[PDB]
């Protein structure tokens, strides 16, 4: 049962990434989108920032960059699992989930890797994008159709070797207020940060992950239900 890109997008929409506390709004205020969702995310950050519970675990560490890219599928799925679990911290009665531009892509990677149909149609990749003088400032999750390989560091991923049918998943962009059509399971041409996509470095490839086959699916529950 082939899953459509829209069905993949709707799955990611269920995670309500726009409801996250985006912790590096304090670092990159100008990355807030000119949308209702961007306006709301800015307000949610302000309240979070001035709330003492933000300086308690695991929220405090959730805001901290995780520089080491996870090399096992299970870690990604665990990342999504732990981010979604209920907590006592609420902002105006709202569960608090926290991420940033380096770790946000890990959540989506987990969600995507946890679907049995995704794993047969797509390889999952996590890349460092937004290249600046040897550093890659923005992590992104890729859905690569099966059987297309990606360059391994120090080789860079470029437009020329970007596999046809690759879908981009950037929940950080959604946290910042971009609509799903610009960030969740879409071709690069529709991607909000297409202008900083290449060059990129590929830090994780599910196709090179030998623990993948032993890694199970269907561990996660969609954070919300679909409206009718």
């Amino acid at each position: 049962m082939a899953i459509a890109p829209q069905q993949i997008q709707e799955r990611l929409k269920q995670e309500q990434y726009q409801k996250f506390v985006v912790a590096d709004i304090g670092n990159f205020p100008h990355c807030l989108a000119q949308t209702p969702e961007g306006i709301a995310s800015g307000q949610r950050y302000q309240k979070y920032s001035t709330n003492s519970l933000s300086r308690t675990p695991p929220f405090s560490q959730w805001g901290a960059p995780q520089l080491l890219t996870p090399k096992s599928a299970q870690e990604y799925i665990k990342f999504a699992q732990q981010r979604n679990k209920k907590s006592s911290f609420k902002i105006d009665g709202e569960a608090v989930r926290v991420s940033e531009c380096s770790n946000f892509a890990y959540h989506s990677a987990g969600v995507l890797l946890d679907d049995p149909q995704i794993r047969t149609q797509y390889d999952v990749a996590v890349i460092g994008s937004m290249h600046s003088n040897g550093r890659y400032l923005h992590n992104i999750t890729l859905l690569v159709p099966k059987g297309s390989r990606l360059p391994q560091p120090p080789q860079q991923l470029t437009a020329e070797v970007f596999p046809i049918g690759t879908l981009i998943v950037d929940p950080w962009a959604v946290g910042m207020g971009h609509p799903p059509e610009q960030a969740l399971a879409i071709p690069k041409e529709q991607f909000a940060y297409n202008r900083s996509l290449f060059p990129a470095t590929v830090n994780y490839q599910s196709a090179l992950d030998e623990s993948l086959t032993s890694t199970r699916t269907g561990q996660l529950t969609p954070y919300t239900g679909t409206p009718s």
Binding site: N27, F28, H30, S60, A64, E100, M130, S132, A192, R195
Partner: protein
């Protein structure tokens, strides 16, 4: 042109704010004449958002000095160094966003020489310490330079610019060397230096700063000791340290 339509223009026309927003429409250079015609027909529109399109330097040439637009967002296009050079010739623009356009040091060289500019957003533009040198001589009151490898030499130059009141420079390869010189600055009222390599070594200088009321130092290397020092400065009403290895 071949993409922009009258329907796009009227849906993008916010008559309450006198603002025209045309982001994500894949507009090209050839669409600029129609755009300017519409703006000339509605002179009250002085704020324009052209972000996330496919405009090049040629499109800028078709736009500049056509309208009374004073606030322009043309981020996430492809205008390059020459596009920035041309914008620097515009006689109405005072607030400009050219982020994500690969304008480079040469692009910023022109913009920094434009005394009309009050506010410049130029995130991710391959701006280096050389470009920061140019901006250090500008009359800009606010600059946002996130995702540009300015390095210490870069922000040290910027720190000498007496005109800048607000500086945003997160993920700019700034260490304690650069941060300390920015701390010594007596004009900045807002400074954001997230995602850099700043440590507790800078914090005494920020504690003794007398100008800042906003200071964001998230996702650096600051510890609880640095936090304690920073919190002695009560002039800073907005202090952000999220993401530092505190406690």
């Amino acid at each position: 042109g071949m993409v922009l339509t009258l329907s796009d223009l009227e849906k993008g026309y916010d008559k309450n704010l006198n603002q025209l927003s045309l982001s994500f429409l894949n507009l090209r250079d050839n669409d600029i004449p129609l755009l300017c015609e519409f703006l000339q027909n509605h002179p009250a529109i002085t704020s324009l958002d052209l972000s996330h399109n496919d405009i090049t330097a040629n499109g800028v040439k078709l736009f500049v000095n056509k309208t009374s637009v004073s606030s322009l967002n043309i981020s996430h296009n492809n205008i390059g160094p020459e596009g920035a050079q041309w914008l620097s010739e515009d006689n109405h623009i005072t607030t400009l966003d050219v982020s994500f356009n690969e304008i480079g040091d040469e692009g910023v060289k022109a913009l920094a020489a434009n005394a009309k500019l009050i506010t410049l957003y130029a995130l991710y533009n391959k701006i280096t310490k050389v470009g920061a040198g140019y901006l250090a001589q500008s009359n800009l009151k606010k600059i946002d330079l996130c995702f540009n490898s300015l390095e210490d030499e870069g922000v040290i130059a910027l720190a000498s610019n007496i005109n800048i009141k607000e500086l945003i420079a997160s993920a700019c390869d700034v260490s304690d060397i650069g941060a300390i010189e920015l701390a010594k600055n007596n004009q900045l009222t807002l400074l954001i230096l997230g995602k850099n390599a700043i440590t507790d070594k800078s914090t005494l200088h920020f504690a003794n700063n007398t100008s800042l009321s906003t200071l964001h130092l998230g996702s650096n290397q600051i510890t609880a000791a640095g936090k304690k020092i920073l919190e002695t400065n009560t002039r800073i009403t907005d202090l952000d340290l999220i993401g530092n290895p505190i406690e």
